[PDB]
């Protein structure tokens, strides 16, 4: 077994470290995908706070299991990673993504994670 | 001010998805880049553990202040960010990253964090 405050660093600081990442960077719990942990780049692109412990559907209804949500029901249920590649979100921007599982000691799915990467500027240089 | 664990999530929780986040990460501290918080993809790119606590330099002197320590630094010392592209690191490998300073509420630098990249099949790709 790992010892975590020693192997991967005490929670407090784990959490403030996490914040500060310069990534955006989301967490999500159970069947209906309820906020965990989102950091200060998250909280920028979508600038809706307070968010913690809701279910992600229920804060972003203009989505709708389209196509995205379906796709993390699909990790969570599964447990195949999945990977987007330049989506469109309505300004006009486009995302890269990774969705992966979150596993418990007894190997059962607990939610998901991912790292988003905002490409508009790339996508949009092409003349 | 923020309410933490409404708006970025509890401290165990967030940890817990930081563990998880399928990028490596890294959160260091103080003017000698103690190691605060390392997540299972960092340790599976680096199998030297039980780790927090120590002074970089300290768990890997086989490279000094070259080049890498010397800009932890210029980002600890000036809060100036700092990217690296496809840096080369003896198997032999090639890392993007990019370094970001985290600052106290009073505005002064506590520390830096880390995302990074193992981008080599990228440049062996280099026929």
Do not use: C
Request: a negative charge.
């Amino acid at each position: 077994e790992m010892d975590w405050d020693k192997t991967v660093g005490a929670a407090e600081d784990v959490r403030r470290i996490f914040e500060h990442i310069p990534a955006i960077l989301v967490g999500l719990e159970g069947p209906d995908h309820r906020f965990v942990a989102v950091n200060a780049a998250y909280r920028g692109f979508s600038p809706l706070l307070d968010t913690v412990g809701q279910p992600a559907r229920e804060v972003y209804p203009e989505l709708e299991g389209q196509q995205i949500y379906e796709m993390l029901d699909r990790v969570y249920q599964t447990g195949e990673p999945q990977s987007g590649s330049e989506w469109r979100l309505q300004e006009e921007r486009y995302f890269d993504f990774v969705v992966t599982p979150r596993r418990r000691a007894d190997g059962s799915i607990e939610g998901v994670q991912l790292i988003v990467d905002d490409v508009t500027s790339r996508v949009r240089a092409r003349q």
